[PDB]
């Protein structure tokens, strides 16, 4: 089988800045599984970032952790089987190693285990600057 | 939560030469779990290397994907906490991102699947030239 997932983007910012973030999906998996991302901070396990509904076309669902409500954004664009992960005015403390994340049980855009991911794309190191 | 895997080594190799992987786990994940490896060739999803379970006692049982029988050793140690695979007669077949795994449902090393994975560590690429 065929990696499903492929991350795009990445480096180091200064705090206030922002950074725009890419995976794209097979057909298959963007149509059918929620699509989300996690961040895997030093030291510490990854958590939650944000989650999109399955196959987000015209219209979607999007939810959040409360860390980053209202600064981070995700989206997509069916044409490119693409995610984005918008992040906004950056603290040092979003430093870490991002990872999207598919679910083929889910359908609604919500908290996301990650023991129930199905497929991961290659952590990319966003780093923040003080 | 603090980070529950944490691995070491990696590198270039020569075709036919031997390379060792290790990762640690928190006290409570590896008592908890059934340890294995994954790997990643360029472009594909991960695939099962092997496992490896606690029995009563110093005892373990370890399982080998097919790819893998005979090549590599996979082991464990309580007072460290850490899982081993050690990989002898390496091929450019072999070249792939290592992953380590947690399984806290498995209780005997069999085949794992990945979507049934708790947590990972972070990738670590292998390379073999020919």
């Known amino acids: 089988m065929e990696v499903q997932l492929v991350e795009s983007g990445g480096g180091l910012v200064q705090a206030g800045d922002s950074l725009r973030l890419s995976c794209?999906?097979?057909?298959?998996?963007?149509?059918?599984?929620?699509?989300?991302?996690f961040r895997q901070a030093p030291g510490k396990e990854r958590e939650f970032?944000?989650?999109?509904?399955?196959?987000?076309?015209?219209?979607?669902?999007?939810?959040?952790?409360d860390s980053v409500r209202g600064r981070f954004s995700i989206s997509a664009d069916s044409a490119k089987n693409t995610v984005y992960l918008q992040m906004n005015s950056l603290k040092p403390e979003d430093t870490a190693v991002?990872?999207?994340?598919?679910?083929?049980?889910?359908?609604?855009?919500?908290?996301?285990?990650?023991?129930?991911?199905?497929?991961?794309?290659?952590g990319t190191q966003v780093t923040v600057s003080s | 939560m603090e980070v529950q895997l944490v691995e070491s080594g990696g590198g270039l190799v020569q075709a036919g030469d031997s390379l060792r992987l290790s990762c640690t786990a928190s006290?409570?994940?590896?008592?908890?779990?059934?340890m294995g490896w994954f790997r990643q060739a360029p472009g594909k999803e991960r695939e099962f290397v092997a496992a490896?379970?606690?029995?009563?006692?110093?005892?373990?049982?370890?399982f080998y994907a097919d790819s893998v029988r005979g090549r590599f050793s996979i082991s464990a140690d309580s007072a460290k906490n850490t899982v081993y695979l050690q990989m002898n007669s390496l091929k450019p077949e072999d070249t792939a991102v290592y992953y380590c795994?947690?399984?806290?449902?498995?209780?005997?090393?069999?085949?794992?699947?990945?979507?049934?994975?708790?947590?990972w560590g972070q990738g670590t690429q292998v390379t073999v030239s020919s």
């Open positions: 795994a947690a399984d806290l449902k498995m209780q005997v090393a069999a085949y794992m699947n990945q979507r049934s994975v708790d947590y």
């Open positions: 006290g409570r994940t590896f008592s908890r779990a059934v």
């Open positions: 490896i379970s606690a029995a009563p006692g110093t005892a373990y049982y370890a």
